[PDB]
Amino acid sequence: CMERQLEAARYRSDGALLLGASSLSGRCWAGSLWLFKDPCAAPNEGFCSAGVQTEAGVADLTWVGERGILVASDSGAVELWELDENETLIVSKFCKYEHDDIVSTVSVLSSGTQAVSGSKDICIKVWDLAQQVVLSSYRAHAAQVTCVAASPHKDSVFLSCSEDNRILLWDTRCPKPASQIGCSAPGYLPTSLAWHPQQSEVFVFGDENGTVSLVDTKSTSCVLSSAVHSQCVTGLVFSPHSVPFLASLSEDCSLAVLDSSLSELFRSQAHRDFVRDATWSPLNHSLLTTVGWDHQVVHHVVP
Amino acid sequence: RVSSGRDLNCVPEIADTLGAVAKQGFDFLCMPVFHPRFKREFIQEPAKNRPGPQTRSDLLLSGRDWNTLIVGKLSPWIRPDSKVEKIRRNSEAAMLQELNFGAYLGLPAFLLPLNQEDNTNLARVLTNHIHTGHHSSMFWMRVPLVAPEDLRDDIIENAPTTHTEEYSGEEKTWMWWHNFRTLCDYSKRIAVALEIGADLPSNHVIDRWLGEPIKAAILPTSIFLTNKKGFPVLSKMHQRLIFRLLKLEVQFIITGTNHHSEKEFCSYLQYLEYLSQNRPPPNAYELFAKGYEDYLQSPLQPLMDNLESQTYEVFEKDPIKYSQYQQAIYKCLLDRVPEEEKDTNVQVLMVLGAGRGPLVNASLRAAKQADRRIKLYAVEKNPNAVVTLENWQFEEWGSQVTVVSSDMREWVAPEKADIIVSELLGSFADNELSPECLDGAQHFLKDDGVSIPGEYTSFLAPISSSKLYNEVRACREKDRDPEAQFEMPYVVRLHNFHQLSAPQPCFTFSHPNRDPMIDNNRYCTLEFPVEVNTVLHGFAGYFETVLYQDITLSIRPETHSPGMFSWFPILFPIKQPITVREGQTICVRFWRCSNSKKVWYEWAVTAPVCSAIHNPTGRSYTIGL
Ligand SMILES: Cc1cc(NC(=O)C(=O)N2C[C@@H](C)CC[C@@H]2c2ccccc2)cnc1N
Ligand SMILES: CSC[C@H]1O[C@@H](n2cnc3c(N)ncnc32)[C@H](O)[C@@H]1O
């Protein structure tokens, strides 16, 4: 019962590497969470620091502080897994079945005490991670929720996008908490979201046609957009750098790295199936780690 | 009881899962046949050359289990009507692949969503698969009462939900189904899986799905309220809709996760059980007709043809109908023969079409009840039934009854009748030619004689049934007009249909008919006000008859004789369905036509659009004289 489809890769503050994996084919359709204190040793199971089996697949993943792992299950559950005091084991803390279909996306809020999940049931939920209960449930979209992304510094603010062709800016302090923003007219469906690390007020969204767009929330007009990929943009991750780089992932099996004006600086074809996630090393800010359905963990050096 | 399946979109181990749902009490499982999240490339390298296996093995279940227990589900990423060309082309190839795997496994049904307005390419690809070898498999189109967009929380500040009457818009989901099914040419392999939300729409939105081929109703765990004990239950309006659906013997599918944590997953199902067991049980008519729902039969012609033994047997198993004939003869005998003449005045009583004698016996029961003397002739041209009559006459009746083995239009009667009694009525009253038969027998009724029945009237009503339209369509036969099946009536216990307007009288006949100029031909125009959006597939026909004074028979639904099962309604189809909008008038025209040899019906719709004249000159359907 092994899992070869790599879904998620997230570097912890101290440089350790978190992997989420699904079996999407064969007898068992399950999933697994791994921790690699040596990042170069991955994805080889024998030289892991910790591992565990899940009941079902993992569609998305995120750190919760330093020991916590928050999982978007195929089962409809959101799961919180804690780390052992010695970080040898990975034990389940809570598994709550509150979505009616696949949970596709999760995002931790700035506080670190709350999170938001998006599902194929079209719903979005806000979670209390101490009380293990749903605070709010929102049916704002008319189709599956592709992506939810917490504002970096405001607990009440986060983005969402959906196959209903809506990008919603959320503020839970407003009686009507969602607001529709984007380009002037008919977009190709939004597929990925990334807040700017420095500017509260700006973000990027990738579309299903391969375009990457820079958006100002206030101006609600697409500043820039470039044809980066030949297929769907599945992820967008800003580097930790003072003037940050943008990494874009695609079903076209390529990594691109872009500047603030969305010009192409780097491009890797090393993957020979879809590219699912990316994290920048917090130790070496020029190191970028990608994982994909070809079970490859590639470590790129970025000029 | 209830046949019901579990919906899952997550199956780690098909053995363990199927075993869990069986224990829970489910009859079948709707599940993915490829992993829902496993998008596949068919055109671009390198993803195209992804190593296999592409899904789990057919060896994991018995052929029996695939054939009976598993409904396939189309992967949610498959979007043949995407605005992106690469996603259309890839979804085309992926749809064929998933459907072809379904056929490979011999699955009884495959689920596909209608979740947007444009499903043209989806329909083209399904239609292409359907015409790739004749297979049995069903396609269940998953469509909601209410579109998600029209159900959303009113929580987008700069995009509010409209609080205004949108009559046609609230029906948008039916038009999604209608357009898909039309594109696919009304294939009998494409049915509806109707999905039901937390808040039901207006009734008119529900009534749209009357006459539609609903094989499944999908109930999400969300819509279940909670009670004192903790048990999942439904709103009284949800219970109403279930009761409607139970009469369409649909399959119930439970979808979503167990929100009633403290209670098991038997409970949800146990509620539906509780609901089906605690409905109003079947009455005498429903229990009788249970097997006949929407079964098309050609109308009997007891004049041109000799009915079988077993056909008379069902005619005679109708005690309400013969009670009414007895009472009509009882009241007639008292009006014609005064008390002080009871010993002297013997009335001449003639049964015209006596079969195996049930009216003969009702005539004797009547005379013994009214305490009046009668003389019976039993007239029957079916010489097979005449055998039954003559054994009765020698064994029990004696010389009171004279059996006459001949046509009532030829028989030289020795004396005239006080009363002629007959039962020559079809489902459309005059469609067995009672008028022509009793006309030819009139000359041997006394100048002041009574026909029982004295009067009958046919009724028509426009109906919608995409289900019966398909049943008629499938009555094509070699060596005749390809469209002949649309130009002839059927006797049917109409079940899956919508009555679009109140029945109205079509044709009336009076007996005796004293008129110097007897013409049994007829031309009638009917205007039917329709107050819904719908589709016209034909006209339901019924009749009422006066036996004597206030004693009557009726199969017109509003006045239907209670507990009488001798007659089902008749159906006049039309060749091409007709769109009818709310507010519009359906105008139909019916003719009764004749020559020496044949009687027939012709008909036409003249509004809101014209049909062809159906059955011109009796080319497809005639009733023999
Ligand atoms: C007494 C009488 C009765 C009838 N009744 C009917 O035809 C009729 O509605 N049904 C439907 C069902 C009740 C089974 C018998 C018969 C039927 C059988 C097989 C082919 C079609 C029809 C007609 N005419 C007369 N005279
Ligand atoms: C009880 S169904 C009607 C009966 O009337 C009989 N019938 C119909 N037409 C005639 C006719 N012209 N003469 C005598 N019997 C008839 C049929 O054979 C059938 O048994």
Q: What is the DSSP string of B447-514?
A: EEEEEES-EEEEEEEEEE-HHHHHHHHTT--TTS-TTGGGSS-EE-B--S-EE-S--EEEEEEESS--
Residue B408 annotated as binding site: yes
Q: What is the tally of structural domains in chain A?
A: 1
Q: Is the peptide bond before B160 cis (omega within 30 degrees of 0)?
A: no
**CA B354 – ligand 2 centroid, Å:** 7
Residue (of B261, B201, B272) closest to B234 by Cα position: B272
Cis-peptide into B282, omega within 30 deg:
no
* Experimental method of this PDB entry: X-ray
Closest-CA residue, ligand 2 atom 16, reads B353
Backbone angles phi, psi at A98, to 5 degrees: -125, -25
CATH number at residue A275: 2.130.10.10
Sorted by sequence, the CB contacts under 8 Å of residue B102 that are 6+ apart come out as B33, B72, B110, B137
- How many beta-carbon contacts under 8 Å exist across A and B? 131
* Beta carbons within 10 angstroms of residue B329's beta carbon: 29
CB A89 within 8 A of CB A110: no
- Cβ burial of A46 (10 Å; 0-12, 13-18, 19+) is exposed
B149 catalytically annotated:
no
CB B579 within 8 A of CB B535: yes
Whether B152 sits inside 8 A of A178 (CB atoms) is no
Count other Cβ atoms within 10 Å, centred on residue B425: 21
The residue of A5, A22, A27 whose CB has the most chain B CBs within 10 angstroms, and thus the best one to mutate to test that interface, is A27
Asked if the Cβ–Cβ distance from A25 to B38 is below 8 Å, we say: yes
8 Å CB contact between B2 and B269: yes
Contact yes or no for B182/B120 (Cβ under 8 A): no
Instruction: Determine contact: A47 vs chain B, CB below 8 A.
Output: no
Number of domains chain B contains: 3
Task: Determine the 3-state secondary structure of B515 from DSSP.
Answer: coil
SS3 B579: strand
Q: Which of B579, B592, B585 is nearest to B618 (CA)?
A: B592
Looking at the complex, does the CB of residue A218 fall below 8 Å from at least one CB of chain B? Answer: no
Q: Are residues A122 and A131 in contact, defined by beta-carbon separation less than 8 angstroms?
A: no
Q: Say whether B56 and A30 touch across the interface (CB within 8 A).
A: no
Same domain? B398 vs B503: no
How far apart are alpha carbons B605 and B36 in whole angstroms? 49
| B interface test, pick of A100, A168, A295 with most B CB neighbours within 10 Å | A100
Tell the burial category of A119 from Cβ atoms under 10 Å away from its Cβ (0-12, 13-18, 19+).
buried
What is the distance in A from the centroid of ligand 2 to the CA of A277? 84
Among B433, B454, B475, identify where a domain stops.
Answer: B454
The owner of tokens 């369409």 is B248
| Residues of B with Cβ-Cβ distance to A75 under 8 angstroms | 10, 257
The number of CA neighbours under 13 Å toward the Cβ of B383 is 1
- Residue of minimum CA distance from atom 11 in ligand 2: B407
Q: How far is the C-alpha of A35 from the C-alpha of A15, rounded, in Å? A: 11
Alpha carbon B517 to chain centroid distance?
40
DSSP string, A245-284: -EEEEETTS-EEEE-TT--EEEEE---SS-EEEEEE-SSS
Q: To which H or E segment does residue B602 belong?
A: strand B598-607
CA distance B61 to chain A (A): 12
Query: To 10 degrees, the CA torsion angle through A8, A9, A11, A15?
Result: 140
B330 CA distance to ligand 1 middle (Å): 26
Six-digit token string for A147: 């992506």
3-state SS, B333-361, equals HHHHCCHHHCCCCEEEEEEECCCCCHHHH
Q: Which residues of chain A have a CB within 8 Å of the CB of B82? A: 208
- Of B462, B490, B465, B466, the C-alpha closest to B569 is B490
Instruction: Among B382, B406, B421, B422, name the best residue to mutate to test ligand 2's pocket (greatest count of ligand atoms within 8 A of Cβ).
Output: B382
Q: In what order do the strands lie in the sheet with A264-268?
A: A233-238, A246-250, A255-258, A264-268
CA dihedral B20, B22, B26, B27 (to 10 degrees): 140
Beta strands in B275-421 (DSSP E): 346-352, 373-379, 401-404, 417-421
The angle formed by the CA atoms of residues B165, B166 and B169, to the nearest 5 degrees, is 165
Q: How far apart are CA A190 and CA A177, in angstroms?
A: 20
- Helix (H) or strand (E) segment spanning residue A178: strand A178-181
A94 at B interface, C-beta within 8 A: no
Q: Are strands A178-181 and B251-255 parallel, antiparallel or unpaired?
A: unpaired
Nearest CA in chain A to B155: A176
User: Is B432 noted as a catalytic residue in this protein?
Assistant: yes
A253 CB neighbours in chain B (<8 A) are 46-47
For the sheet containing A287-292, what is the strand order? A275-280, A287-292, A297-301
* Distance (Å, whole) CA B11 – CA B547: 66
Range of the domain at A159: 1-303
Do B614 and B489 contact (CB within 8 A), yes or no?
Answer: no
**Distance to chain A for B492, nearest Cα, Å:** 43
d(CA B419, CA B332): 9
**Is B407 marked as binding a ligand?**
yes
Annotation-wise, does B321 bind a ligand?
Answer: yes
Q: Which residues contact A279 (CB under 8 A, 6 or more apart)?
A: A9, A10, A11, A17, A237, A288, A289
In angstroms, the separation between the Cα of residue A123 and the nearest Cα of chain B is: 10
**CA quadruple B573, B579, B584, B589: dihedral positive or negative?**
negative
Pocket of ligand 2 (CB under 6 A): B 302-303, 307, 315, 353, 355, 379-382, 385, 407-409, 423-424, 437
Instruction: Compare CB distances from B155 to A76, A140, A272 and report the shortest one's residue.
Output: A140
Q: Which SS3 state, helix, strand or coil, does residue B535 take?
A: strand
Number of neighbouring beta carbons within 10 Å of residue B89: 14
Residue from the list B12, B83, B158 with its beta carbon closest to the beta carbon of A180? B158
**Nearest alpha carbon, ligand 1 atom 24:** B426
| Cα(A241)–Cα(B583) distance, integer angstroms | 68
B335 and B381 together in one domain: yes
Which residues lie below 8 Å from residue A42, measured CB to CB, with a gap of 6+? Answer: A17, A19, A34, A36, A48, A297
Q: Any idea what DSSP says for residue B281?
A: P
**Which residues, 6 or more positions from B260, have their beta carbon under 8 angstroms from its beta carbon?**
B221, B224, B226, B230, B231, B232, B267, B268
Which sign, positive or negative, has the C-alpha torsion B164, B165, B171, B175?
negative
Q: Is the dihedral of CA B332, B337, B340, B346 positive or negative?
A: negative
CA–CA dist A26, B168 (Å, integer): 47
Nearest ligand, measured from the Cα of B625: 2
**Cβ pair B487, B571 in contact under 8 A:** no
What order of strands is seen across the sheet that includes strand B373-379? B401-404, B373-379, B346-352, B417-421, B445-452
Q: Among B310, B75, B558, which residue's Cα sits nearest to residue A25? A: B75
The range of the structural domain enclosing residue B331 comes to: 288-454
Contact B154 A97 (CB under 8 A): no
Element (H, E) at B145: none
Q: How far, in Å, from the CA of B425 to the mean position of ligand 1? A: 10
Q: Please, are residues B439 and B519 in contact by the beta-carbon 8 Å criterion?
A: no
For A102, phi then psi, to 5°, come to -45, 130
For chain B, helix (H) and strand (E) counts, in that order, are 15, 26
Using the mean position of ligand 1's atoms as its centre, give its distance from the Cα of residue B312 in Å. 9
Residues B566/B560, Cβ–Cβ less than 8 Å: no
Q: What is the largest CA-CA distance in chain A?
A: 53
Between the two ends of chain A, the Cα-to-Cα distance in Å is 40
* Cα B94 from Cα B39, distance rounded (Å): 9
Residues in chain B: 625
- The Cα–Cα gap between A222 and A225 comes to 7
**B125, two tokens:** 């690809």
Catalytic residue among B423, B471, B487, B544: B423
Angular region, B618: left φ>0, alpha ψ -120 to 50, beta rest: left
- Residue A159's closest CA among B563, A151, B187? A151
Q: Which residue has the tokens 């999240």?
A: B37
Looking at ligand 2, which residue's alpha carbon is closest to its atom 5? Answer: B353
CA distance A155 to A170: 11
Residue B547 and residue B324 in contact, taking contact as beta carbons nearer than 8 Å: yes
User: How far is residue A224's CA from residue A214's CA, in Å, rounded to a whole number?
Assistant: 5
Neighboring chain B residues of A122 at a CB cutoff of 8 Å: 148
Q: Do B156 and A176 touch (CB under 8 A)?
A: yes
CA dist., res. B594 & res. B104, Å (int): 56
Spatial separation of the C-alpha atoms in residues B537 and B579, rounded to whole Å: 10
Instruction: Read off the CATH number of the domain in which B495 is found.
Output: 2.70.160.11
User: Residue with the nearest Cα to atom 10 of ligand 1?
Assistant: B567
What is the token pair recorded at A135? 């605070």
Pairwise CA distance, residues B486 & B483, whole Å:
6
Q: Which of B212, B432, B487, B602 is catalytic?
A: B432
**What is the DSSP secondary structure assignment for residue B549, as one 8-state letter?**
T
The CATH number of whichever domain residue B338 belongs to comes to 3.40.50.150
Neighbouring C-beta atoms of residue B516, cutoff 10 Å: 4
Among B141, B182, B110, residue whose Cα is nearest residue B470: B182
Q: Are B31 and B11 in contact (CB under 8 A)?
A: yes
| Residue B313 DSSP SS3 | helix
For chain B, breaks with the C atom over 2.5 A from the next N come after: none
- For residues A98, A99, A104 and A108, what is the CA-based torsion angle, rounded to 10 degrees? -30
Put simply, whether A95 touches B (Cβ < 8 Å) is: no
Q: Which of B413, B432, B454 is the last residue of a domain?
A: B454
- The closest CB to that of B148, out of A28, A122, A174, belongs to A122
Which residues does chain B have within 8 Å of residue A160's beta carbon, measured at their own beta carbons? none
CA A243 to chain centre: 22
- CB contact (8 A) between residue A102 and residue B37: yes
Segment (H or E) for B193? strand B190-195
Where does residue B33 rank: exposed (0-12), middle (13-18), buried (19+ CB within 10 A)? buried
Distances (CA, A) of B398 to B61, B128, B387, B457: 72, 71, 15, 37
Whole-angstrom distance, CA of residue B65 vs CA of residue B69: 5
Last residue of some domain: B238, B269, B287?
Answer: B287
Residues B459 and B593 in one domain: yes
Q: How far is the CA of B423 from the centre of ligand 1 (A)?
A: 12
CA distance B217 to B276: 14
What is the C-alpha radius of gyration for chain A, rounded to an integer number of angstroms? 18
Nearest by CB: A97 against B35, B47, B257: B257
Nearest ligand to residue B318 Cα: 1
